C-alpha cells in the first residue's frame, strides 16, 4: 500500500483547501484511513480518520465542525475538506492507512505542506 497526498497550499485565514491521498499498490484490500498533522517542533496529532466499509467518521476537537473527511471507493482516495483555516492549521499533513494516537497506522504517505497566513 502506497500513499501520495496532494491539495497543500497556501491561504489567508478564513479560507478553504481540500487534500487527497491516493492510494496505489495493493489497493483490492480494504483499510481505514486517516488524516495526521505536525507542525514544527511539536508532536504530529490526529486529525480525522475513516472507516473505509461504513464511511463512518472521527473528528479531533480542534477541527470539528470545520473539516470533513470523505473517501470515494472508485478513486481510492481519502480527502480531508478544510474551511475556516486558521493560522494554526498550518502543518504538515499526512495521510495513513491501517486498521482502526497514531499507532493502528501501518503505512504513511509524504506529507504536504499547509499554510494559513493571518
Known amino acids: 500500500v502506497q500513499l501520495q497526498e496532494s491539495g497543500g497550499g497556501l491561504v489567508q485565514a478564513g479560507g478553504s483547501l481540500r487534500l487527497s491521498c491516493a492510494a496505489s499498490?495493493?489497493?483490492?484490500?480494504?483499510?481505514?484511513m486517516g488524516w495526521f498533522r505536525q507542525a514544527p517542533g511539536k508532536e504530529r496529532e490526529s486529525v480525522a480518520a475513516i472507516n473505509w466499509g461504513s464511511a463512518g467518521t472521527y473528528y479531533a476537537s480542534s477541527v470539528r465542525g470545520r473539516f470533513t473527511i470523505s473517501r470515494d471507493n472508485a478513486k481510492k482516495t481519502v480527502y480531508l475538506q478544510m474551511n475556516s483555516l486558521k493560522p494554526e492549521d498550518t502543518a504538515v499533513y499526512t495521510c495513513?492507512?491501517?486498521?482502526?494516537?497514531?499507532?493502528?497506522?501501518?503505512?504513511w504517505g509524504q506529507g504536504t505542506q499547509v499554510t494559513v497566513s493571518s
Open positions: 499498490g495493493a489497493t483490492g484490500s480494504t483499510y481505514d
Open positions: 495513513g492507512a491501517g486498521r482502526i494516537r497514531e499507532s493502528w497506522v501501518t503505512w
